[PDB]
Design a binder for this molecule. Structure first.
Ligand SMILES: *[C@@H]1O[C@H](CO)[C@@H](O[C@@H]2O[C@H](CO)[C@@H](O[C@@H]3O[C@H](CO[C@H]4O[C@H](CO)[C@@H](O)[C@H](O)[C@@H]4O)[C@@H](O)[C@H](O[C@H]4O[C@H](CO)[C@@H](O)[C@H](O)[C@@H]4O[C@H]4O[C@H](CO)[C@@H](O)[C@H](O)[C@@H]4O)[C@@H]3O)[C@H](O)[C@H]2NC(C)=O)[C@H](O)[C@H]1NC(C)=O
Ligand SMILES: *[C@@H]1O[C@H](CO)[C@@H](O[C@@H]2O[C@H](CO)[C@@H](O[C@@H]3O[C@H](CO[C@H]4O[C@H](CO)[C@@H](O)[C@H](O)[C@@H]4O)[C@@H](O)[C@H](O[C@H]4O[C@H](CO)[C@@H](O)[C@H](O)[C@@H]4O)[C@@H]3O)[C@H](O)[C@H]2NC(C)=O)[C@H](O)[C@H]1NC(C)=O
Ligand SMILES: *[C@@H]1O[C@H](CO)[C@@H](O[C@@H]2O[C@H](CO)[C@@H](O[C@@H]3O[C@H](CO[C@H]4O[C@H](CO)[C@@H](O)[C@H](O)[C@@H]4O)[C@@H](O)[C@H](O[C@H]4O[C@H](CO)[C@@H](O)[C@H](O)[C@@H]4O)[C@@H]3O)[C@H](O)[C@H]2NC(C)=O)[C@H](O)[C@H]1NC(C)=O
Ligand SMILES: *[C@@H]1O[C@H](CO)[C@@H](O[C@@H]2O[C@H](CO)[C@@H](O[C@@H]3O[C@H](CO)[C@@H](O)[C@H](O[C@H]4O[C@H](CO)[C@@H](O)[C@H](O)[C@@H]4O)[C@@H]3O)[C@H](O)[C@H]2NC(C)=O)[C@H](O)[C@H]1NC(C)=O
Ligand SMILES: *[C@@H]1O[C@H](CO)[C@@H](O[C@@H]2O[C@H](CO)[C@@H](O[C@@H]3O[C@H](CO)[C@@H](O)[C@H](O[C@H]4O[C@H](CO)[C@@H](O)[C@H](O)[C@@H]4O)[C@@H]3O)[C@H](O)[C@H]2NC(C)=O)[C@H](O)[C@H]1NC(C)=O
Ligand SMILES: *[C@@H]1O[C@H](CO)[C@@H](O[C@@H]2O[C@H](CO)[C@@H](O[C@@H]3O[C@H](CO)[C@@H](O)[C@H](O)[C@@H]3O)[C@H](O)[C@H]2NC(C)=O)[C@H](O)[C@H]1NC(C)=O
Ligand SMILES: *[C@@H]1O[C@H](CO)[C@@H](O[C@@H]2O[C@H](CO)[C@@H](O[C@@H]3O[C@H](CO)[C@@H](O)[C@H](O)[C@@H]3O)[C@H](O)[C@H]2NC(C)=O)[C@H](O)[C@H]1NC(C)=O
Ligand SMILES: *[C@@H]1O[C@H](CO)[C@@H](O[C@@H]2O[C@H](CO)[C@@H](O[C@@H]3O[C@H](CO)[C@@H](O)[C@H](O)[C@@H]3O)[C@H](O)[C@H]2NC(C)=O)[C@H](O)[C@H]1NC(C)=O
Ligand SMILES: *[C@@H]1O[C@H](CO)[C@@H](O[C@@H]2O[C@H](CO)[C@@H](O)[C@H](O)[C@H]2NC(C)=O)[C@H](O)[C@H]1NC(C)=O
Ligand SMILES: *[C@@H]1O[C@H](CO)[C@@H](O[C@@H]2O[C@H](CO)[C@@H](O)[C@H](O)[C@H]2NC(C)=O)[C@H](O)[C@H]1NC(C)=O
Ligand SMILES: *[C@@H]1O[C@H](CO)[C@@H](O[C@@H]2O[C@H](CO)[C@@H](O)[C@H](O)[C@H]2NC(C)=O)[C@H](O)[C@H]1NC(C)=O
Ligand SMILES: *[C@@H]1O[C@H](CO)[C@@H](O[C@@H]2O[C@H](CO)[C@@H](O)[C@H](O)[C@H]2NC(C)=O)[C@H](O)[C@H]1NC(C)=O
Ligand SMILES: *[C@@H]1O[C@H](CO)[C@@H](O)[C@H](O)[C@H]1NC(C)=O
Ligand SMILES: *[C@@H]1O[C@H](CO)[C@@H](O)[C@H](O)[C@H]1NC(C)=O
Ligand SMILES: *[C@@H]1O[C@H](CO)[C@@H](O)[C@H](O)[C@H]1NC(C)=O
Ligand SMILES: *[C@@H]1O[C@H](CO)[C@@H](O)[C@H](O)[C@H]1NC(C)=O
Ligand SMILES: *[C@@H]1O[C@H](CO)[C@@H](O)[C@H](O)[C@H]1NC(C)=O
Ligand SMILES: *[C@@H]1O[C@H](CO)[C@@H](O)[C@H](O)[C@H]1NC(C)=O
Ligand SMILES: *[C@@H]1O[C@H](CO)[C@@H](O)[C@H](O)[C@H]1NC(C)=O
Lengths: 102, 128, 112, 125, 453, 132, 132, 76, 48
């Protein structure tokens, strides 16, 4: 079992800034996928293969890292982007980090 | 485009069995896998299984074997060969499994894997 | 079969003096294409044979000009102008004009 | 012709069978064929060619002195070729070599390709 | 000195990776027997003898099994060649008739459900005004009830009418040698321990590849090409779940498959010139088709594949082989062809073991179908006509296709289950060595020489 | 002679050899560059493509200094920005597959340079033979 | 540099220009002369026709004095009955499309003349190198 | 066949003085009885056995003189 | 028009009628051209 842990838990920011979210895998050498989910909608794919973005995704999201460490940096936070973000390897999911308005 | 529509929400009894439909439309159905994932409150996501609808070979999670079952139904029609139906017959329903259930499909790019699930169903909540 | 005789069978040689080794066949080695099919190998102790002289007088690349080969159709001589320590070992002539391939009996240069 | 690998039993008692295999790594670097042979050397004695075969044919040549006891075959898909010897006498104690030979026309001047495996000493006792 | 000049060189060896349409070659032994005995006896060229396996030094080629070419091309080639080998045979649209079926003359036990039905029905003669009442035998996997009384119809009449394969043609695999066209080269990785992705330090160019038998087997790929020393597993990403694990072992396990009834075929003339080959009577006893595998050799090869598969999951893991999980009948079970008859042989007798960190035979039963739906298209079948006599074929299992289970929850064991899925995983186990490259001449290099006037 | 084989300069036979060594055997790559129901059609769809692209690169030699000389001294000065490396380490160390990746970025200015230089020296030769 | 474009010697780009001006840019017409279900078949029926006729005119240059020099000093005296007009008004006034109509009647004797002159000078060169 | 002339001494000269010495084992007959008596169809049968060494000979001679010409223009 | 019947001198050609080509080729050509000239015409299966 590959357990993914997500670092920031709850993260409180104001709109306009940038935010970094960190996850640390259990084994290294695999890609990462990042999802977002608002309050009461279907989730959507933000990043697959740990660096590329999905369709209908602006370039303010970018994710990077390697080995066991992975980052998702979102630039210029808006009000609607405050949502819970889920990390995802092969079958395993993180518990998720929450972005909250300040 | 690609659409994944499900059935409506249901209320079932402990020990009964739910049957969730998932109709896919807008692509050649006999090619891409269909995964089934669930979302339990206060425990994060949890994968259930996948099904390759060309023949119907499935694979389930290790902690859910002997309870879940997945079938598919192809479109035997040379005029609309795109649409198709996947099913899940989730049996052994206990009060812990009150959740939302999504049927998802992978992306269509070349460097997309299988697990980057791009297209999502609307999700069906079951409460027991 | 062509019988290959190499002379002598055992000749210990002191380093630095010249040497000449004779080889004889029971038949001519001139083949249809005009080639004389005789090769000379040296097998140093505990090592594989290594080709030294091939058709009539030509040395394989990397082999010094100290080694020279001469001969007729049936009588051949390998001469070593200045003997060095790594020349020790068993020298062999070999025919390939006809099957079976046959080797001379060898000449062992050894330190007494 | 980059590599030759000999294999077979290292000590054999006189009633069993001598079987040797030579595996060729890097068959040929040009059009044509190679000739692959087995050659043996008794202790303090000369080299004796047991037999061989061209890569271009399935006909094998044997030394008549060996009394038709040797059988040599090949299979290029496994890049192997084999020698089998039965009955045995103490006179078959020898270092056994695999060899690959061809005339080499790839250079500006005619030259030779001539490669030998390291050999395996087989003592029968 | 520093006045160095451009010189072109035409006909210099450098290649790039490319995709192109390849080209058949068949051996002359397949040309010795003629007259469309099997397919691709005219659609492909006679081969040249002694193919030039030319070794290269100092070369590190990046091979890839999974994003390879030559496999989707081979798959389109074999399905198009399947389609062209059915056009001259007859079409069975006058057979979708209301059949009246019954049970075969047999001591029916209630536990054993009979795989044969005896069906009689009207059928047109070559004289269009008259019709004849004929009877035949069908398998229960080909008819379905229409709703006391009993009336059946064929399984495909509400989807597609479909073609009886005209039985002068045969279905055994003959070897196909793929060849590159002029101006392309085929590279072969001569390394031994080569798992199928990355650099291969000993390559060799080939004009035309070796004998590839196109077999159609779902799990347990038969008549394949063995390994060299080990049993080799290979995967695209082994920590993934959706990608099958291809296993190929060195010494094959032989398998003896049979059906022990002797069908007597009969010709029922549909119309003018078109005949339909039905099953007549079974003389002798009726029995179930089966296959036999040697138990000790199967246990030894499973021991070898466990000793190999522990290198990727830690040595202290408990490997458990279970049977197939479910799905359609052509993937839950070992599907193959044997002498022109399609077998579907149960597989739970083999894939059932648990391996911990420390002259008998297996008989596995089969069911046979006459109506196939191979490659899973929308409006196709093939009604395979019956074969006279008992049927026996001996083959040699060389490989396996496995699939992990997607385990969560602190799992210390790994369960492996067989699964056929695609048919391209079969030929992907045979074209792993080969890459196709576009040679390009005309390099440009500086040197010390100048053109005069 | 018996018991001995013969090797002959195989196709792609020196692909890992040195550029100075591969510069002596170019002709085998040129010889095995041209010679060697809808299926005939599709291999016909292969075959003419082969001959088409063959003529294409020979057309390029038709435009530069040499139609069929198969090596070619020209009159374009080699810009040191492309390689900046001395001759004795190019012709005696590297292989061709490394060199192709090394200067694969620097192409398509060499082709126009060679085209202009050949046309320039051609019209100068025509003016030289014109005044006689 | 920004705000500025770049033009590059287009196909048929000097068809209305002067013959003396069109005589400097011939290579683009040569480069864009070769490279660029039954429908594939019919465009296959186009494509090989292209390559066929391409080889045909190069075969004509194979017979006259130059295989690939793309302009060609020859040894046939220009009959003044064909043109009777001086050089400085031909190379500096007229365009090529007018010249083709002007001497389109006088062809097919030039081709045999060039063929005979090339074969004649070839056998004379063989006799010249023969006596050495 | 034009590719063959691409490899030997002349791409399009349509006759070709070369630099391979004519072995007298192929023909052993003097020039004035060859060029003034025989026809070509007889000559093709007469030397049809002796081919494929001439082609490799011409190939090696052309490549040899080509690299010697490159070395000659190299030292300037 | 006017096909060029070109005579040759001093020529002895070995002809053979019976192991000739151009006749099995002509026979396959005429039977294939027979087959292609019947495909658009009707089929008479309702007349038996
Ligand atoms: C994995 O690879 C193995 C390789 O061995 C392969 O097994 C072989 O399969 C093929 C076909 O599947 C088998 O070939 C058939 O063999 C039977 C019996 O052969 C006997 O006789 C021959 C010749 O004397 C011997 O070599 C052999 O050892 C047996 O003693 C033949 O009868 C078959 O021929 C019939 O079909 C042909 C199809 O065109 C006809 O041309 C031929 O004339 C035969 O038809 C006649 O009989 C029919 C029935 O009576 C009749 O209806 C016809 O009108 C006609 O009269 C065929 O050659 C071969 O035997 C198998 N090998 C062994 C050792 O058994 C596996 O199949 C392969 N696995 C997979 C999955 O493909
Ligand atoms: C699938 O189902 C069909 C349909 O029933 C079976 O076919 C029939 O099988 C029965 C077997 O009992 C046959 O009945 C026998 O018919 C003999 C007469 O032969 C001709 O008769 C019919 C007219 O009735 C003709 O149209 C036809 O051409 C036949 O050639 C009788 O002589 C037999 O008598 C038997 O019983 C007596 C007393 O018991 C004995 O003394 C006799 O020796 C003999 O055993 C018998 O009545 C019938 O003819 C078959 N019909 C057809 C159309 O063939 C198939 O057998 C069945 N298939 C399987 C595999 O089970
Ligand atoms: C691939 O091959 C495997 C080989 O094992 C098949 O697995 C078996 O499938 C059968 C289904 O046919 C399973 O069911 C068993 O059927 C037996 C037949 O008994 C019948 O009649 C009795 C009395 O009328 C009924 O009670 C019964 O339900 C049947 O209708 C039963 O004897 C079995 O019950 C036994 O279960 C256990 C076994 O230890 C005992 O404790 C019981 O007392 C009883 O004896 C059972 O019902 C069978 O279980 C499967 N085998 C195994 C080992 O599990 C696969 O089915 C086949 N694949 C496919 C697709 O068919
Ligand atoms: C399961 O295993 C397979 C095999 O190892 C693995 O596939 C590999 O994925 C990686 C990452 O996607 C690939 O690496 C890339 O390859 C491309 C090919 O040209 C390169 O262009 C990339 O270079 C850059 O790309 C990005 C720039 O936008 C950067 O993120 C990157 O760091 C580089 O800067 C990159 O090297 C690799 O080619 C494949 N290999 C194969 C054989 O497919 C697969 O990802 C694994 N599964 C999971 C879920 O990880
Ligand atoms: C034709 O098929 C029938 C079955 O459809 C077959 O009849 C059965 O034969 C067996 C053996 O001849 C009979 O004997 C049984 O044998 C076992 C083993 O000892 C016993 O356990 C059985 O006891 C119980 O089982 C029966 C099953 O229904 C019960 O009916 C019985 O009362 C016992 O409770 C029993 O002794 C078996 O009884 C018959 N079954 C029937 C229904 O007749 C017949 O032999 C076959 N004939 C031929 C010629 O093939
Ligand atoms: C072959 O074709 C014949 C001809 O249609 C089929 O026979 C027909 O079968 C039906 C029953 O499904 C008969 O109807 C019955 O007729 C009797 C009178 O004999 C009546 O009492 C019943 O109530 C019922 O209406 C029908 O008459 C009969 N036709 C003939 C000409 O016999 C037959 O079913 C077809 N199949 C086979 C396997 O023979
Ligand atoms: C893999 O192995 C397992 C166990 O060996 C197989 O499971 C068994 O499958 C049979 C056949 O489907 C089941 O028998 C049937 O049960 C149903 C009730 O669901 C009944 O209506 C039928 O009459 C018949 O008795 C059996 O119950 C089942 N056992 C268990 C424990 O699941 C499985 O089928 C094998 N898979 C394949 C593809 O063969
Ligand atoms: C399963 O596959 C193997 C190999 O793919 C089959 O062949 C066995 O191994 C070799 C390789 O073909 C056979 O040797 C052959 O012998 C013939 C006649 O001597 C020779 O002409 C060939 O060149 C080759 O050397 C070998 O005989 C064979 N094994 C046995 C026991 O016969 C194997 O037959 C296949 N089937 C089974 C049931 O194993
Ligand atoms: C053949 O006809 C029917 C249809 O199969 C048979 O009836 C059933 O047969 C199955 C086994 O094939 C049994 O499991 C059922 O219990 C049977 N049902 C009934 C109501 O009998 C019938 O037994 C067969 N034989 C005959 C002579 O009709
Ligand atoms: C299976 O059926 C066939 C018939 O198709 C049997 O062949 C018969 O064999 C006997 C004995 O050799 C001959 O007298 C008959 O003439 C054969 N039948 C035909 C139609 O020719 C075969 O023997 C049967 N085999 C078994 C094991 O039952
Ligand atoms: C599969 O069939 C072959 C062919 O008959 C069997 O091989 C025979 O095995 C018996 C028993 O060991 C021997 O007496 C025979 O000499 C063998 N014959 C041949 C040609 O090898 C094999 O045993 C069968 N396999 C299984 C699992 O039943
Ligand atoms: C699966 O494998 C086992 C052996 O590992 C076979 O043995 C039976 O196993 C079941 C439980 O798995 C036990 O209840 C039985 O008692 C075992 N049989 C005996 C005779 O002891 C089992 O047969 C295999 N399954 C199949 C379907 O073949
Ligand atoms: C597991 O066992 C294998 C057996 O060879 C060994 O190579 C490997 O190092 C072992 N791993 C650990 C972690 O002990
Ligand atoms: C060499 O190339 C660079 C750009 O690659 C260019 O700026 C420079 O002018 C060139 N020099 C010569 C001498 O061609
Ligand atoms: C060609 O381009 C790539 C990417 O633009 C660059 O990294 C590389 O250095 C270039 N090649 C050369 C020889 O400069
Ligand atoms: C020029 O052409 C005319 C016919 O067009 C011919 O009569 C005359 O002889 C030719 N003169 C020369 C010098 O070629
Ligand atoms: C060519 O022929 C036409 C008609 O015969 C004639 O009018 C024209 O003048 C001729 N061309 C030349 C250049 O004389
Ligand atoms: C002439 O050819 C013969 C064989 O045909 C050969 O032995 C001889 O060496 C050749 N001589 C020359 C001078 O090429
Ligand atoms: C060519 O071969 C044939 C038969 O081998 C021989 O008779 C003939 O004399 C040979 N040709 C020449 C010119 O020697």
């Amino acid at each position: 079992e590959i357990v993914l842990t997500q670092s920031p838990g709850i993260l409180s920011l104001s709109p306009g800034e940038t935010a970094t979210l960190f996850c640390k895998a259990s084994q290294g050498g695999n890609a990462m996928t990042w999802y977002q989910k608002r309050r009461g909608q279907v989730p959507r794919l933000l990043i697959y293969d740990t660096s590329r973005r999905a369709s209908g995704v602006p370039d303010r999201f970018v994710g990077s890292g390697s080995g066991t460490d992975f980052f998702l940096t979102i630039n210029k936070l808006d009000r609607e982007d405050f949502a819970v973000y889920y990390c995802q390897q092969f079958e395993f999911f993180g518990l998720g980090s929450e972005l909250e308005v300040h | 485009q690609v659409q994944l529509v499900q059935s409506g929400a249901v209320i079932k009894t402990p020990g009964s069995s739910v049957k969730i439909s998932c109709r896919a439309s807008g692509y050649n159905f006999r090619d891409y896998s269909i995964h089934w994932v669930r979302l339990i409150p206060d425990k994060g996501f949890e994968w259930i299984g996948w099904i390759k609808p060309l023949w119907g070979a499935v694979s389930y999670a290790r902690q859910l074997q002997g309870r879940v079952s997945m079938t598919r139904q192809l479109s035997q029609d040379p005029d609309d060969p795109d649409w198709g139906v996947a099913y899940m017959e989730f049996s052994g329903l206990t009060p812990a499994d009150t959740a939302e259930y999504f049927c998802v499909r992978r992306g269509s790019c070349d460097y997309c894997g299988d697990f980057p699930w791009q297209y999502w169903g609307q999700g069906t909540v079951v409460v027991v | 079969d062509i019988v290959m005789t190499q002379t002598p069978l055992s000749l210990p040689v002191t380093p630095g003096e010249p040497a000449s080794i004779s080889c004889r066949s029971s038949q001519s080695l001139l083949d249809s294409d005009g080639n004389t099919c005789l090769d000379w190998f040296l097998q140093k102790p505990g090592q594989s044979p290594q080709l030294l002289i091939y058709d009539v007088s030509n040395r394989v690349s990397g082999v010094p000009d100290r080694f020279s080969g001469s001969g007729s159709d049936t009588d051949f001589t390998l001469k070593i102008s200045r003997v060095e320590a790594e020349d020790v070992g068993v020298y062999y002539c070999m025919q390939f004009v006809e099957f079976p391939l046959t080797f001379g009996g060898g000449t062992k240069v050894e330190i007494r | 012709q980059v590599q030759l690998v000999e294999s077979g039993p290292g000590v054999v008692k006189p009633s069993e069978t001598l079987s040797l295999t030579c595996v060729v790594s890097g068959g040929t670097p040009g059009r044509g064929f190679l000739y692959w042979s087995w050659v043996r050397q008794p202790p303090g004695k000369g080299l004796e060619w047991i037999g061989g075969t061209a890569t271009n044919t399935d006909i094998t040549d044997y030394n008549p002195s060996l009394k038709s006891r040797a059988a040599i075959s090949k299979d290029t898909s496994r890049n192997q070729f084999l020698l089998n010897l039965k009955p045995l006498t103490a006179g078959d104690t020898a270092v056994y070599y695999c060899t690959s030979r061809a005339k080499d026309y790839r250079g500006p001047s005619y030259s030779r390709i001539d490669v030998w495996g390291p050999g395996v000493l087989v003592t029968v006792s | 000195a520093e006045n160095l000049w451009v010189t072109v060189y035409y006909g210099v060896p450098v290649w790039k990776d490319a995709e192109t349409t390849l080209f058949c070659a068949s051996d002359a032994k397949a040309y010795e027997t003629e007259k469309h005995n099997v397919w691709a006896t005219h659609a492909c060229v006679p081969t040249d003898p002694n193919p030039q396996e030319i070794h290269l030094e100092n070369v590190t080629e990046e091979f890839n099994m999974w994003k390879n070419n030559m496999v989707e091309q081979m798959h389109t080639d074999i399905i198009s060649l399947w389609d062209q080998s059915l056009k001259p045979c007859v079409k069975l649209t006058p057979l979708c008739v209301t059949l009246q079926c019954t049970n075969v003359t047999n001591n029916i036990t209630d536990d054993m459900r009979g795989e044969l039905k005896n069906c009689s029905f009207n059928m047109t003669t070559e004289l269009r005004d008259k019709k004849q009442k004929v009877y035949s035998l069908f398998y229960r996997l080909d008819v379905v009830q229409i709703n006391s009384n009993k009336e059946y119809r064929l399984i495909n009449c509400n989807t597609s009418a479909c073609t009886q394969a005209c039985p002068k043609v045969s279905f055994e695999p003959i070897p196909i040698h793929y060849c590159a066209p002029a101006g392309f080269a085929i590279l072969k990785c001569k390394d031994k321990k080569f798992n199928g992705t990355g650099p291969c330090p000993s390559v060799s160019t080939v004009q035309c590849t070796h004998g590839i038998k196109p077999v159609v087997s779902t799990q347990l790929l038969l008549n394949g090409s063995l390994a060299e020393e080990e049993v080799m597993i290979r995967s695209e990403n082994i920590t993934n779940n959706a990608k099958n694990i291809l296993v190929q072992f060195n010494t094959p396990v032989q398998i003896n498959c049979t059906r022990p009834n002797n069908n007597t075929r009969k010709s029922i003339r549909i119309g003018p010139g078109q005949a339909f080959y039905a099953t007549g009577d079974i003389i002798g006893d009726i029995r179930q088709a089966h296959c036999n595998v040697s138990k000790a050799t199967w246990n030894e090869t499973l021991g070898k594949v466990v000793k190999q598969l522990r290198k990727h999951f830690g040595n202290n893991t408990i490997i458990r082989f279970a049977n197939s999980s479910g799905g359609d009948l052509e993937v839950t079970t070992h599907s193959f062809n044997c002498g022109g008859e399609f077998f579907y042989c149960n597989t739970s007798g083999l894939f059932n073991s648990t391996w911990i960190s420390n002259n008998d035979s297996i008989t596995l039963p089969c069911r046979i179908k006459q109506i196939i739906n191979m490659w899973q298209r929308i409006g196709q079948c093939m009604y395979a006509p019956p074969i006279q006599g008992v049927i026996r074929c001996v083959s040699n299992i060389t490989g396996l296709i496995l699939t992990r289970d997607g385990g969560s929850t602190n799992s210390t064991t790994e369960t492996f289950r067989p699964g056929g899925g695609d048919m391209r995983d079969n030929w992907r186990s045979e074209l792993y060595k080969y890459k196709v490259v576009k040679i390009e001449p005309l390099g440009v290099a500086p040197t010390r020489c100048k053109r005069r006037v | 002679a018996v018991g001995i084989g013969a090797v002959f300069l195989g196709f792609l036979g020196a692909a890992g050899s040195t550029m100075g060594a591969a510069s002596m055997t170019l002709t085998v790559q040129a010889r095995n560059l041209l010679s060697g129901t809808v299926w005939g059609i599709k291999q016909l769809q292969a075959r003419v493509l082969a001959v088409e692209r063959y003529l294409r690169d020979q057309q390029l030699l038709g435009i530069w200094g040499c139609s069929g000389k198969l090596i070619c001294c020209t009159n374009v000065p080699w810009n040191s920005s492309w390689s900046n490396r001395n001759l004795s380490e190019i012709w005696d160390n590297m292989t061709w597959l490394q060199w192709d990746k090394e200067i694969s970025n620097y192409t398509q200015i060499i082709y126009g340079l060679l085209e202009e230089s050949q046309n320039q020296q051609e019209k100068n030769e025509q003016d030289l033979l014109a005044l006689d």
